[PDB]
Structure formats: C-alpha cells, structure tokens
Design an enzyme around this catalytic site. Structure first.
Site, PDB file in Angstrom:
ATOM      1  N   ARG A  71       0.802  -1.226   0.000  1.00  0.00           N
ATOM      2  CA  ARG A  71       0.000   0.000   0.000  1.00  0.00           C
ATOM      3  C   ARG A  71       0.835   1.276   0.000  1.00  0.00           C
ATOM      4  O   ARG A  71       1.889   1.334   0.638  1.00  0.00           O
ATOM      5  CB  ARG A  71      -0.925  -0.008   1.211  1.00  0.00           C
ATOM      6  CG  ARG A  71      -0.311  -0.644   2.435  1.00  0.00           C
ATOM      7  CD  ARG A  71      -1.380  -1.248   3.345  1.00  0.00           C
ATOM      8  NE  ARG A  71      -0.781  -2.001   4.446  1.00  0.00           N
ATOM      9  CZ  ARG A  71       0.066  -3.021   4.292  1.00  0.00           C
ATOM     10  NH1 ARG A  71       0.424  -3.426   3.072  1.00  0.00           N
ATOM     11  NH2 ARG A  71       0.564  -3.638   5.362  1.00  0.00           N
ATOM     12  N   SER A 137       6.571  -4.721   5.535  1.00  0.00           N
ATOM     13  CA  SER A 137       5.697  -5.405   6.481  1.00  0.00           C
ATOM     14  C   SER A 137       5.639  -6.892   6.134  1.00  0.00           C
ATOM     15  O   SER A 137       5.834  -7.292   4.982  1.00  0.00           O
ATOM     16  CB  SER A 137       4.300  -4.810   6.410  1.00  0.00           C
ATOM     17  OG  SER A 137       3.756  -5.034   5.123  1.00  0.00           O
ATOM     18  N   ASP A 168      18.591   8.177   6.290  1.00  0.00           N
ATOM     19  CA  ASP A 168      17.947   8.353   7.602  1.00  0.00           C
ATOM     20  C   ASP A 168      17.995   9.793   8.107  1.00  0.00           C
ATOM     21  O   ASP A 168      17.119  10.241   8.860  1.00  0.00           O
ATOM     22  CB  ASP A 168      18.591   7.447   8.661  1.00  0.00           C
ATOM     23  CG  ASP A 168      18.225   5.991   8.483  1.00  0.00           C
ATOM     24  OD1 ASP A 168      18.616   5.176   9.339  1.00  0.00           O
ATOM     25  OD2 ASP A 168      17.547   5.659   7.488  1.00  0.00           O
TER      26      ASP A 168
END
Ligand code: NA
Length: 424
Positions: A71, A137, A168
């Site tokens: 997603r 995920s 990062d």
C-alpha cells in the site's frame, strides 16, 4: 608525562576555523557540476525541496510493500482555510495479482510502477518528482529502489514521478520539520556521522531549477578522505583508519562517530600504559583487544564526574586493578577523546550553518536543527561541549536543537510523525 600526551588532542579556536573553512571549500566542490563526481563530500541532492512551484518539504510518498499486499501513502503540506499549515494524508492499498506475485522481480515491480503512476495521476501528483519512501511489512496468520527505477524506466514515459529517498538523516530533518517548521538542518551523530541542510536551488548544479531551497545530503563522513584533514589526525586515529575494513575511506567519520570513539580511548589508554604511566605499565589481555573498550563506557564515564565507582567497575571488570589515579587518568582520556570528537563536529555543522547565513542575507538567522543518534543522545558531556562550540562559531544565528521522535528510523519515522500530525 600525561598532561603532555592528552594535550595532543587539543583543538584551539584557530584549528576549528580552519576545519570549518576547509569544509565549506568541500561543500561547493561537491555541489559544483564540473566536480560533483570526483568530489569528496558527495553533497547529493535529495529533492525534498520547497520551491514556488508548490513543492513543500513535508511532501512525501511512502511505499510499504510486504506480502501479497503493498500500500502507498501520500503526504503533501498545505496552507489551510486560514493560511496556517496543514498536512493532508491519503492511503491506498493495492493487491498484487496471483500471476504477478509468483512472477519475477521485473514483473512484480512493473506492476507497482503502473499502480503508482495511476495513484499519482488520480491525485494530480504526476511529474511532480517527489521523495519516495520504502517500508516493509510481513503477513502473519492469526535492491528495490533500483528495480523500481528500471520499471519506471521501462514504461517508456516521462521519468519524473518519484525520486529515491532512503537517507535516515533527511528523514530526521523532514521528521523535525513537522514539529518545528523552522528546522532546516538534519544531523545524525551516532555510530557514524552525517548531516544535511537546505541549500539554495541556485547552488545545486545538478538540479535544473534555480528558484527556491532544497535539502542536500552531504555525506560529510567522507570529508578529509582527500587529505583535507591529514594535518589534524593523530597516531591513534591512524591505527584505526588503517585497521578498519575501509582504509582511507570515511576519515571525518572515524573521528566523530561513536563507532570508534571507544577504540580511540583504548589506544590512547594503551599508549600511556606503554610509556609506563598507567596501571603500573601492564594491561590485561582484554584491554589489549580491538573493540574491547566500548563507546558505551565512555558515556557512562562522562555522565558522572561525581565518583569513580563507574570508572572502577568498567576497568575492574576489564581485568585490571585501578588506582585512585588510574581512574582520573582514564577519565581525562575519555574527556579528551570525546571533546575532540565534539569539536570536530561543531566545526562542520557550523560551516553548514554559516554558509546558510551568508545565503539569506539578514540580521540574525533563527534556524533549528534536528538531531538523532546514540552519541548525541547518550553522551551528556559530548552534547554539552558540542552545543557550545557550535553556538560559539555561529555569530548572529539562533540555533535551537530538537531531537528526533521516539521509536522510528527512516521512511518509517517520516510516515509516522506525519500520519500523526495529520490526525489533527
Ligand atoms: Na538513529
């Protein structure tokens, strides 16, 4: 003696200024198209810009792919019915067809590509060229960045949809931005060291545009890899740089980064015990081991100047018989090593900041800095000296520090700190 030895770590005003200068000399060198490649401090463009076209810093496009369902998430900064500041969020979950999930990387991404293209199209965010995040995920019953490029490339169409963003640090800035919309400088001082700032569009020779400001990833860890600091290194730092899996590479880092900080202290300590000044000249088979003296310890030391208890135990459990003096010696080593590490950092962050003042000519520059990292978060002394040494090199600049949020890293800290700022 000792006071003489540790003395070699000193770094007076002048010393810094020089570094501060030689850094800026490098920032332009990397920012200049004629040399951006052979440069030392890459100064890579992030495209997390903010120009009159509409592009905002908070803007961001995360992509979580895990399992048979990936997603996307959209984030764009707005003004509001008042001209305040807003951050709308838009989620959409695509499902990967069976004939695709059991296919090849090429095929898999060909899909993700189309979907994105569509998704952006449906929200009028096509060709906008915006930051692209990646999350992962894993379904549980009751390199991507490249592959994606190829696919996007295969489409034969305009390759202006997304732009990779994985650093990062950038996210540290972007992350802080949501909290403090005055944050224009991101920095990560932990195991390693790196920073970024909001350069002027008219300075990034790689980008086509010229009006507005865009964040830039310095990757200054490589600073000095071109001798730019050769006359500032010590025998210890050398033994390190010349014993790492990346000799000659990333020297500036191997000076600040808590990845070797502890090691330096060890060498500096092992140095003294050799010239009969510490532990009656006789180290333990432990203290005589690479990495054996963890950074973790240095922090435990500086964190309390009240007693030796902590110093005792570290050393004690190191296989030594500390002495009231032995401790003070070690303390002095840590403080010297850490302070040098801070000062060297202050230098650069300052150059970035100074150079940023020069840009927007004006009275005082009220800028905010987003920081994260183990060193800047677990070394009291380090932080204390680092804040001062910085402010004491940035005349007419209001520098306010703000750590990064709790529990998150890259594309993650971002997507989160924002999904939260959106719920408002
Ligand atoms: Na971190």
């Amino acid at each position: 003696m000792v006071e003489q030895i540790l003395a070699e770590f000193q770094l007076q005003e002048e010393d810094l200024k020089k570094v501060m200068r030689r850094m800026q000399k490098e920032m332009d060198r990397g920012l200049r198209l004629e040399t951006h490649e052979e440069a030392s401090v890459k100064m890579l463009p992030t495209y997390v810009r903010s120009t009159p076209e509409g592009s905002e810093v908070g803007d961001f496009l995360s992509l979580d792919l895990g399992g048979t369902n990936f997603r996307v998430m959209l984030v764009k900064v707005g003004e509001g019915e008042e001209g305040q500041w807003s951050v709308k969020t838009k989620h959409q979950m695509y499902s990967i067809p069976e004939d695709a999930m059991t296919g090849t990387a090429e095929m898999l991404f060909d899909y993700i590509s189309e979907c994105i293209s569509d998704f952006l199209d449906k929200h009028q965010m096509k060709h906008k060229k915006l930051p692209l995040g990646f999350t992962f995920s894993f379904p549980v019953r009751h390199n991507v960045v490249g592959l994606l490029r190829d696919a996007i490339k295969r489409r034969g169409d305009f390759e202006m949809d997304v732009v990779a963003m994985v650093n990062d640090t950038v996210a540290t800035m972007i992350s802080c931005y949501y909290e403090d919309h005055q944050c224009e400088v991101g920095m990560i001082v932990g195991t390693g060291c790196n920073a970024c700032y909001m350069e002027e569009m008219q300075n990034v020779e790689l980008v086509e545009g010229d009006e507005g400001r865009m964040c830039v990833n310095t990757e200054w860890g490589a600073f000095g890899d071109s001798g730019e600091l050769d006359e500032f290194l010590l025998e210890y730092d050398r033994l390190v740089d010349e014993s790492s899996a990346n000799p000659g590479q990333q020297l500036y880092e191997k000076l600040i980064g808590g990845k070797y900080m502890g090691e330096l202290v060890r060498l500096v300590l092992l140095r003294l015990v050799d010239e009969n000044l510490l532990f009656h000249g006789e180290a333990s088979e432990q203290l005589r081991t690479r990495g054996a003296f963890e950074t973790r310890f240095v922090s435990q030391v500086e964190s309390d100047t009240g007693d030796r208890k902590q110093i005792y135990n570290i050393l004690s459990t190191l296989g030594l018989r500390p002495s009231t003096t032995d401790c003070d010696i070690v303390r002095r080593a840590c403080e010297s090593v850490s302070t040098r590490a801070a000062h060297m950092c202050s230098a650069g962050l300052a150059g970035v900041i100074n150079r940023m003042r020069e840009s927007r000519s004006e009275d005082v520059m009220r800028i905010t800095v987003g920081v994260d990292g183990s060193v800047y978060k677990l070394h009291p002394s380090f932080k204390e000296r680092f804040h001062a040494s910085v402010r004491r090199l940035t005349p007419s600049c209001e520098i306010t520090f703000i750590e990064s949020e709790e529990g998150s890293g890259r594309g993650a800290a971002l997507v989160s700190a924002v999904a939260c700022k959106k719920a408002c």
